[PDB]
Design a protein around this ligand. Structure first.
Ligand SMILES: [Mg+2]
Length: 420
């Protein structure tokens, strides 16, 4: 009921991390283009096989003088995987501890970014080369206020364009251009890639890259489909620059979650030149890349620890929108006060000081195991509370009882995603 909002609201305001005026509003008026980079982990950035770079385009962005790149950014997903990361981008709220929030909470009342942005006249659309029913997206996007859903009905699903879950990234990005250029501006858009999906085979000759030689074909083929993903982003960027949308936009790209689980530890230790992959090393491998190119704004390679729930306020702040009145779990990464103790969905966490995995603590810098006696419990408490506040919102559908100042309530029945 209405009184349970109070405790959550008092904590969200008691922790809000205010905006950096070096950055706040500096991208006001711009389009937003999100790209979800399927199963892409940060270890891939700058990685080479036989002296050949695996992700040369993404590497250039990582090394340029203009793009924000975050090398200590972590996925915070659970069992809803791709859609768990989408939920966090739009809501700055954690997904469910078990099962999928997209599948089970699509009737919650939400106050998403695409919905916030309506009062600034943003049209919102998702692009994805698979049916709209996948991960219950067609129900959940309506709750999120997404105006348009360009699913697989809008792509040529032939022989050579289709792999496993649907469209390959290269033709998916080509075909999305006229659809994207038809959008009244300003627009807020999501591109959900498909091609870098487990077990990571790619067809010859859709890419020319060698497979690694690590004794495991899942891991061997990862590098080939990652290289293909990288060419797709390059083409997308070239096309964004032909049509003039590159200078009119904030492009935000993120790996959605890990692609390589602990079932492949034997090969991953070879990938890393290590004897074995420990619990600690695996925690380090949950880094996913985050890139933000905000046109008109000089980006920095930022090393602050951050997670998925931090993206939405970073972006909103860049657009000049004040997030103090919203119930959001995340903290603007560009903020001076930005918190760096990063929860994982299962209650583990990572921070510059500590990595905590199944109740063990390690020194984040060195991997050295720490005994419980010498650990400051204050970080663990911050984590529990951060997760708890979010869970109260989602479990009690608390946003029915909260009205932020700008916000006009979303009516899911407004949206229709049938292709005519
Ligand atoms: Mg995924």
């Amino acid at each position: 009921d209405s009184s349970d909002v109070t405790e959550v609201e008092n904590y969200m305001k008691a922790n809000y991390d205010v905006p950096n005026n070096v950055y706040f509003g500096k991208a006001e008026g711009k389009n937003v283009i999100y790209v979800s980079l399927e199963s892409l982990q940060s270890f891939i950035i700058d990685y080479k096989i036989d002296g050949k770079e695996v992700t040369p385009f993404l590497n250039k962005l990582a090394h340029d003088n203009e793009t924000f790149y975050f090398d200590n950014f972590f996925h915070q997903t659970g069992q809803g995987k791709t859609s768990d990361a989408e939920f966090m981008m739009e809501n700055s709220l954690y997904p469910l501890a078990q099962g999928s929030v997209f599948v089970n909470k699509a009737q919650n009342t939400l106050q998403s970014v695409p919905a916030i942005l309506k009062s600034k006249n943003y049209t919102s659309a998702t692009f994805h080369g698979n049916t709209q029913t996948f991960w219950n997206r067609n129900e959940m996007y309506k709750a999120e206020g997404i105006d348009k859903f360009f699913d697989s009905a809008y792509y040529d699903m032939n022989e050579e364009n289709t792999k496993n879950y649907g469209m390959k990234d290269k033709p998916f990005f080509k075909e999305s251009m006229p659809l994207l250029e038809s959008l009244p501006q300003p627009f807020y858009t999501k591109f959900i890639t498909l091609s870098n999906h487990f077990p990571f085979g790619m067809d010859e000759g859709d890419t020319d890259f060698p497979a690694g030689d690590f004794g495991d074909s899942v891991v061997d083929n990862y590098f080939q489909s990652a290289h293909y993903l990288d060419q797709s982003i390059e083409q997308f960027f070239n096309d964004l620059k032909k049509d003039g949308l590159y200078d009119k936009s904030i492009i935000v790209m993120y790996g959605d979650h890990y692609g390589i689980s602990e079932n492949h530890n034997k090969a991953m230790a070879k990938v890393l030149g290590k004897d074995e992959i420990t619990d600690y090393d695996n925690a380090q491998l949950q880094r996913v890349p985050l890139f933000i190119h905000a046109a008109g704004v000089k980006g920095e390679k930022v090393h602050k620890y951050a997670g998925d729930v931090d993206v939405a306020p970073t972006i909103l702040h860049l657009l000049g929108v004040d997030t103090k009145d919203y119930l959001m779990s995340g903290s603007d990464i560009l903020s001076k006060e930005h918190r760096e103790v990063i929860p994982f969905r299962n209650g583990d966490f990572i921070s510059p000081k500590y990595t905590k995995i199944s109740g063990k603590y390690y020194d984040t810098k060195t991997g050295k195991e720490l005994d419980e006696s010498e650990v400051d419990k204050s970080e663990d408490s911050l984590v529990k509370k951060e997760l708890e506040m979010s869970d109260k919102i989602i479990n009690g559908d608390l946003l029915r009882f909260y009205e932020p100042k700008g916000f006009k309530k979303v009516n899911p029945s407004d949206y229709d995603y049938t292709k005519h």
